[PDB]
Symmetry: C2
Subunit: 200 residues, 2 copies
């Protein structure tokens, strides 16, 4: 809509169901369909036994790994795309994966120059949704794995550390989630946010 | 595949992809497509920090929740379907979800009478594959989520606890995985396996 529409159709054709081998492929990566309620039960177990902040890191890093892999897929489809066209593939794959409906708001990107400032709308976040099913409204944003995805995708695409934060979140009782991504240097508590992406 | 193509077709009508709202639904359960490499990363951190047995518990229970939800879906499609044809939806759903290719070996089931004896072949288990990439070959079977699913699905379908175990597995170097399920009592170590399906 309109680049989103082409993006979605372009990338949705890389998604493949190999039922003969019990497998689902997205580009070169094997995928599974997982119940959000099952992932939600795991999350509750982690939060109850390891604590909110350790569980938050576990999921952010899982999201990070997903993002890096989708960026590797986006790179194989470089041919004939602007830097924005390649960036947009992240929102599209996240949407195709059923994780969240992503709408890019303002995107400033130039990979060779190391330029990146990105704001995105998130609707129907599976994560904020299922977190609020189990813990009720939280006070801090809670789409941990989703934020990890954006951070991994964009960092892999730019070749430098790009961190994201939710400025608004359904898990906090907002109409929607809203995110901002920019280089580590432009974040007040940057090195504390980067620390979350390393194994504890 | 004879009764399996039927189930696979019949149950594919229940899988809805809507990039319109960034969601995916299987029956009345919301799903996400998740990279097995991302699930692998999570598993590595859980095993390394919590220990292999406590991590095994978390994955078995996540699988259990998935299997229970899918048995709920199979129940809504019992219109003219024998006990076996309903049992079979489990292996079908597992395959559609890209977890593993399942082939029923021999299945004895009567839901009314509380009798169940079932043996299955597992080809291309995602879980065994990703485990050997994160840890190398393991000494004991490793398809934890996949076993939880079988246990949860069958138990919910029978209305009695049906436990499974892997008699062989790719995670141990074998060409494929192979499993056996029967009622709790009929396992000499049944009650201890049951302990694994309960959170702290
Ligand atoms: C770059 C990006 C990727 C995913 C996402 O949800 C938002 C933005
Ligand atoms: C009943 C069942 C369900 C799933 C599976 O993988 C095997 C057997
Ligand atoms: Zn959110
Ligand atoms: Zn196995």
């Amino acid at each position: 809509s309109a680049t989103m529409r082409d993006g979605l159709s372009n990338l949705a054709r890389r998604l493949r169901f190999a039922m003969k081998e019990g497998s689902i492929w997205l580009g070169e990566q094997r995928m599974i369909l997982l119940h959000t309620a099952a992932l939600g039960a795991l999350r509750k177990e982690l939060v109850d036994t390891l604590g909110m902040e350790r569980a938050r890191g576990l999921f952010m890093r899982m999201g990070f790994h997903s993002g890096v892999r989708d960026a590797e897929l986006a790179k194989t489809m470089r041919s004939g795309h602007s830097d924005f066209g390649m960036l947009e593939m992240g929102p599209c794959l996240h949407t195709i994966e059923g994780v969240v409906r992503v709408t890019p708001l303002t995107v400033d990107i130039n990979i060779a120059a190391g330029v990146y400032h990105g704001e995105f709308l998130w609707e129907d976040s599976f994560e904020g949704d299922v977190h609020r099913q189990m813990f009720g409204v939280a006070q801090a944003p809670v789409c941990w794995m989703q934020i990890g995805y954006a951070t991994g995708y964009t960092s892999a695409l730019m070749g430098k550390t790009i961190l994201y934060r939710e400025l608004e979140c359904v898990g906090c009782g907002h109409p929607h989630c809203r995110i901002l991504g920019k280089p580590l240097e432009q974040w007040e508590d940057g090195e504390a946010e980067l620390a979350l992406y390393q194994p504890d």
